């Protein structure tokens, strides 16, 4: 009985931390920013693969639902 006290919260924290540009969605720019900050100098292509893996909206930004989905998918949360 997690309910309130659920992985959803942690996902949402990660979503916010990722969404540096505060689009309410995680963009390629956000992913690059995150990656660079961690040290991961990821390419356009690498990022677009990640994008495409999560994106089912065809807008190029990972929305909360998509993020939740892939976070579950990958056992990230």
């Amino acid at each position: 009985g997690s309910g309130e006290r659920d992985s959803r919260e942690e996902i949402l924290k990660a979503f916010r931390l990722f969404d540096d540009d505060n689009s309410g969605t995680i963009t390629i720019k956000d992913l690059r920013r995150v990656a660079k900050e961690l040290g991961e100098n990821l390419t356009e292509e690498e990022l677009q693969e990640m994008i495409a893996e999560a994106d089912r909206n065809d807008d190029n930004e990972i929305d909360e639902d998509e993020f939740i989905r892939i976070m579950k998918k990958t056992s990230l949360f």
Partner: peptide, 19 residues
Amino acid sequence: KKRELIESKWHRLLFHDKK
């Protein structure tokens, strides 16, 4: 397995445990 290799990046961003 591209799927795995790509998922590994999402994994790595958050699981960036120092390394």
